[PDB]
Design an enzyme around this catalytic site. Structure first.
Site, PDB file in Angstrom:
ATOM      1  N   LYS A 100      -7.870   6.986   1.196  1.00 60.47           N
ATOM      2  CA  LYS A 100      -7.870   5.554   0.919  1.00 60.47           C
ATOM      3  C   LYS A 100      -9.277   4.969   1.014  1.00 60.47           C
ATOM      4  O   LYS A 100      -9.698   4.233   0.115  1.00 60.47           O
ATOM      5  CB  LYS A 100      -6.924   4.810   1.850  1.00 60.47           C
ATOM      6  CG  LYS A 100      -5.452   5.072   1.569  1.00 60.47           C
ATOM      7  CD  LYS A 100      -4.609   4.229   2.495  1.00 60.47           C
ATOM      8  CE  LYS A 100      -3.144   4.414   2.260  1.00 60.47           C
ATOM      9  NZ  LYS A 100      -2.407   3.781   3.376  1.00 60.47           N
ATOM     10  N   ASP A 217      -7.097  -1.722  10.831  1.00 61.99           N
ATOM     11  CA  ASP A 217      -5.704  -1.801  10.413  1.00 61.99           C
ATOM     12  C   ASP A 217      -5.078  -2.997  11.113  1.00 61.99           C
ATOM     13  O   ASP A 217      -4.839  -2.971  12.323  1.00 61.99           O
ATOM     14  CB  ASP A 217      -4.942  -0.526  10.766  1.00 61.99           C
ATOM     15  CG  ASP A 217      -3.582  -0.444  10.076  1.00 61.99           C
ATOM     16  OD1 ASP A 217      -3.033  -1.499   9.675  1.00 61.99           O
ATOM     17  OD2 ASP A 217      -3.059   0.683   9.929  1.00 61.99           O
ATOM     18  N   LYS A 257      -6.625  -3.505   6.593  1.00 61.42           N
ATOM     19  CA  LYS A 257      -5.266  -3.348   6.095  1.00 61.42           C
ATOM     20  C   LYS A 257      -4.372  -4.499   6.569  1.00 61.42           C
ATOM     21  O   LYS A 257      -4.401  -4.881   7.738  1.00 61.42           O
ATOM     22  CB  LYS A 257      -4.671  -2.047   6.603  1.00 61.42           C
ATOM     23  CG  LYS A 257      -3.502  -1.566   5.795  1.00 61.42           C
ATOM     24  CD  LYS A 257      -2.584  -0.742   6.662  1.00 61.42           C
ATOM     25  CE  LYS A 257      -1.234  -1.424   6.788  1.00 61.42           C
ATOM     26  NZ  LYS A 257      -1.409  -2.897   6.820  1.00 61.42           N
TER      27      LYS A 257
END
Length: 398
Positions: A100, A217, A257
């Site tokens: 990613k 994240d 994220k």
């Protein structure tokens, strides 16, 4: 009642849409002094339509609920057959998150592994023996880091903070293992003292400048409520935004994220980053599953003079800790009148939310069709893996 076959050819090529340039001034303490509003704790996603069409939101909610009745193994097999990008996902790196970052490093002009000064020149050449400094904050720190250290090897130095337990790091790749290239900090990111501690640790190891970029994240998964993850993760998301403003150096970058951004709390948070960075965009890479809500807030070039915003979020976090386990919550961090006052920001936000919903509906419909007809296939999965590796500069190996 969905046509998933009317969709554009899957491609390795991806388009980035950025928020328009912010031309408004960074808010200061006095301006933000009535911005935090506390209200009843609420978990009703279906009426969060300030930045998304109501009908569209209900449709996507409806598809997700039908789709969740489905048996897990069966749906997972179908989703594997249906995803044109399924075959890149697992290749080369030990950790999927590394691919990613590979994807997004390419998409954003290597701004993470090859950051530039204002004249457009590389800040970090190999010769100069100067280090690329980075931070990785997540449940298992190492996955994002695996990519960075693979790419920059000993010319980089990373700092890790884990969201889970003390030993939940991913120090398994040949580089993450060396404490010289990656230093975990020895686990609750919501405690103010932990935020400050990590901040100081990072400042003391980067000549009080901060890191070149932070990878975070800002969401966690829950079984049986995809819709609710945005709300459940709201404090984590705030803390990551707060971390960005605490440890990223001037001109540095931030990638986070998150899930859905339907709520004014979420959108307020994004508005604040949009005030503090040269360029912000919301992006869903082809390496994240097309049927889920995962996306990335990508922030380019931290501006000077963001301390008031940083301090503001720090205060909001403390208030959140105070309201935790009661029927009260912080429901806004920026007023709607302010966010909606910025027409171009708002237009982008709605267009982003709605585009995501529209595509997600199609992706779920496609999976359902692949469940009902197991002979359907996505023939170009192999060709697409190959093109992506070449494009992103990743070996065709393990």
């Amino acid at each position: 009642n969905v046509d998933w076959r009317d969709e554009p050819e899957p491609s390795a090529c991806e388009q980035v849409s950025w928020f328009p340039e912010c031309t408004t001034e960074i808010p200061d303490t006095q301006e933000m002094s009535d911005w935090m509003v506390v209200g009843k704790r609420k978990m009703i996603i279906e009426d969060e339509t300030e930045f998304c069409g109501e009908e569209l939101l209900h449709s996507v909610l409806q598809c997700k609920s039908v789709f969740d009745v489905l048996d897990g193994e069966e749906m997972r097999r179908a989703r594997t057959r249906a995803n044109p990008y399924e075959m890149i996902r697992g290749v080369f790196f030990l950790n999927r998150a590394a691919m990613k970052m590979a994807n997004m490093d390419f998409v954003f002009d290597r701004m993470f592994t090859n950051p530039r000064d204002s004249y457009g020149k590389p800040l970090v050449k190999d010769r100069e023996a100067e280090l690329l400094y980075f931070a990785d904050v997540c449940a298992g720190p190492g996955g994002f880091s695996e990519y960075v250290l693979w790419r920059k090897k000993w010319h980089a130095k990373g700092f890790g903070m884990t969201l889970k337990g003390p030993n939940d790091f991913k120090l398994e790749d040949f580089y993450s293992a060396s404490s010289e290239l990656f230093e975990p900090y020895y686990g609750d990111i919501t405690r103010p003292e932990n935020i400050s501690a990590f901040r100081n640790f990072v400042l003391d190891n980067t000549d009080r400048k901060g890191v070149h970029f932070l990878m975070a994240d800002g969401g966690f998964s829950v079984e049986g409520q995809e819709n609710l993850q945005e709300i459940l993760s709201k404090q984590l998301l705030l803390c990551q935004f707060l971390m960005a403003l605490s440890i990223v150096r001037t001109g540095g970058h931030f990638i986070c994220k998150t899930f859905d951004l339907f709520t004014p709390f979420s959108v307020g948070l994004v508005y604040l980053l949009y005030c503090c960075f040269e360029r912000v965009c919301l992006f869903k890479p082809i390496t994240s599953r097309p049927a889920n809500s995962e996306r990335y807030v990508v922030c380019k070039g931290l501006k000077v003079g963001i301390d008031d915003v940083r301090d503001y979020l720090f205060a909001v976090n403390i208030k959140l800790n105070q309201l935790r386990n009661t029927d009260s919550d912080v429901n806004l961090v920026v007023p709607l009148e302010v966010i909606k006052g910025d027409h171009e920001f708002t237009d982008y936000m709605i267009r982003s939310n709605e585009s995501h919903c529209s595509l997600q509906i199609k992706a779920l419909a496609k999976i359902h069709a692949f469940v009902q007809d197991t002979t359907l296939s996505e023939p170009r999965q192999a060709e697409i893996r190959k093109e992506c590796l070449r494009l992103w500069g990743i070996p065709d190996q393990a």
